[PDB]
Amino acid sequence: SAFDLDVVKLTAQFVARNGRQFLTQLMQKEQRNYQFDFLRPQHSLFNYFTKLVEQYTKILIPPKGLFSKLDQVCYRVEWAKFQERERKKEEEEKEKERVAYAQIDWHDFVVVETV
Amino acid sequence: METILEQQRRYHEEKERLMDVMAKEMLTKKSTLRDQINSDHRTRAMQDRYMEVSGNLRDLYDDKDGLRKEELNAISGPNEFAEFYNRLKQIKEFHRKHFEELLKARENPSEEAQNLVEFTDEEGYGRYLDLHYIN
Amino acid sequence: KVTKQRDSEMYPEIAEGIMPRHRFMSAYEQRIEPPDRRWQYLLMAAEPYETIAFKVPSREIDKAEGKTHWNRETKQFFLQFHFKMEKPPAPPSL
């Protein structure tokens, strides 16, 4: 897949600075169906493309700026674990309900009125 | 030659991967951070520390996590230590690192070695995996 | 809409399960077996207390249309249109 990866990432590199300026010209010059598919949102890989470009677009963000930098990400993790536990418990209770519903006499009738 | 954009990209991506790893860790067993933070509290007085209840119940938000034994807590803390080392290194190199005719020019050379029958699913998977032993 | 009230406080068993449960039963099957039948009942059940039924002559009432989140609980009927005030012990059904 090295080829596909490389072309996606390259057209993504140029597409990140020239946007469709160099790629939108390449598509019409070369004439590629493959190139057209890459440009298009029909071809699945397109999505990942939208990723790479964004990423490169990001590198252009703080060019000329250095990064001079955990607890939070840990706490988020913790939260996720908690939520997971709630989900589990719920599933359990539901299970109980299914058991009892399946296990009671629906023939022990004693009605009062009607609508 | 080598497009710096790709390198800096891969760097930010790896940093992201590491942060995500040590964050997953801090998630499964909050003690990892809590423990640490508590000590930090008595060295740098300013440090803000979580609600005591959280610490005790070993929870970060709603879910109370299973208590781990000391050897594991320490282990993971040293692992996170080396992780943070890697991160600091990458951050460093990154700080030190940070047309159409050329587009077709390179896209042409990309045609090189067309017959390369091989599946390539090992860039983010080998890293994600590289930071997440047994069978 | 039905409002069923329960005891006034007069081992993780019967409380763990969502309060009680409702089901629509056809009168085609009855214990006395006198012979009469041909209508439905909106039976409501809770572990200790005795079952309760409500006759529904109308073929269909309040049978809504997509009032899609999937926690089946017991069935579409229960999650769709029941409330269990467990703090006050009041079961509403509509």
Is the alpha carbon torsion for B95, B98, B104, B106 positive or negative? negative
- Please state, in angstroms and rounded to a whole number, the distance separating the CA atoms of residues A63 and B8: 10
Rounded to the nearest 10 degrees, the angle between the axes of helix B4-28 and helix A2-17 is: 110
A114, containing H or E segment? strand A111-114
Residue (of B5, B8, B6, B1) closest to B93 by Cα position: B8
Residues 6+ apart with CB under 8 A from B24: A77, B132
Sign of CA dihedral B117, B113, A1, A41: negative
How far apart CA B80 and CA B26 sit, in angstroms, is 10
How far, in Å, CA of B99 to CA of B3, rounded? Answer: 13
d(CA A56, CA A61): 9
List the structure tokens of C73: 């609980």
The alpha carbon of residue A16 is apart from the nearest alpha carbon of chain B, in Å, by 10
Query: Which chain A positions have a beta carbon within 8 Å of B13's beta carbon?
Result: 55
Closest in A2, A59, A73 to B5, CB measured:
A59
* Minimum distance, in Å, between the CA of residue C6 and any CA atom of chain A: 17
Q: Tell me, what DSSP letter sits at residue A113?
A: E
Instruction: Name chain C's partners: 3 or more CB pairs within 8 A.
Output: A
Supply A88's token pair. Answer: 């589990």
B63 contacts A71? CB cut-off 8 A: no
User: What is the C-alpha separation between B22 and B20, in angstroms, rounded?
Assistant: 6
DSSP B41-80: HTTSTT-----HHHHHHTBSSSPBPPPPPHHHHHHHHHHH
Residues 6+ apart with CB under 8 A from A57: A16
Q: Which of A81, A82, A86, A89 to mutate to test the interface with B (most CBs of B within 10 A)?
A: A81
Q: How many CB atoms lie within 10 A of CB B33?
A: 28
Among candidate residues B25, B41, B39, B38, the one with its CA nearest the CA of residue B73 = B25
Q: Report the side by side order of strands in the sheet with C21-26.
A: A111-114, C53-56, C40-45, C21-26
Backbone φ and ψ of B121, nearest 5°: -130, 65
A78–B104 CB contact, under 8 Å: no
Annotate chain C with three-state secondary structure. CEECCCCCCCCCCCCCCCCCEEEEEECCCCCCCCCCCCCEEEEEECCCCCCEEEEECCCCCCCCCCCCCCCCCCCHHHHHCECCECCCCECEEC
Which chain C residues are closer than 8 Å to A99 by Cβ? 17
Q: Which residue reads 């299970």 in tokens?
A: A95
Cα gap B66→B124, rounded to integer Å: 30
**Dihedral (CA of B11, B13, B15, B21) sign:** negative
The dihedrals phi and psi of B63, each to the nearest 5 degrees, come to -85, 125
Q: Which chains touch B (3 or more CB pairs under 8 A)?
A: A
3-state secondary structure of A112: strand
**C-alpha B112, offset from chain centre:** 34
Q: What distances in angstroms separate CA A64 from CA A55, A68, B29, B91, C24, one per listed residue? A: 17, 13, 38, 14, 71
Structure tokens at B132: 């997440």
Residues in chain C: 94
| Signed CA dihedral, A95, A96, A97, A102: sign only | positive
Against chain A, the chains showing at least 3 CB pairs within 8 Å are: B, C
Identify the bridge partners of residue C73 per DSSP, sorted by sequence position: none
Helix (H) or strand (E) holding A111: strand A111-114
Compute and round to an integer the Cα radius of gyration of chain C: 15
CB-count burial class (<10 Å; 0-12, 13-18, 19+) for B18: buried
Q: Report which residue type is found at B135.
A: N
Rounded Cα gap, residues A61 and C49, in angstroms: 68
Contact B80, B25 (CB under 8 A): yes
C73/A97 CB distance under 8 A: yes
- Non-local (6+) Cβ contacts of A4 within 8 A are A45
The experimental resolution of this structure, in angstroms, equals 3.2
Nearest CA distance, B20 vs chain A (angstrom): 7
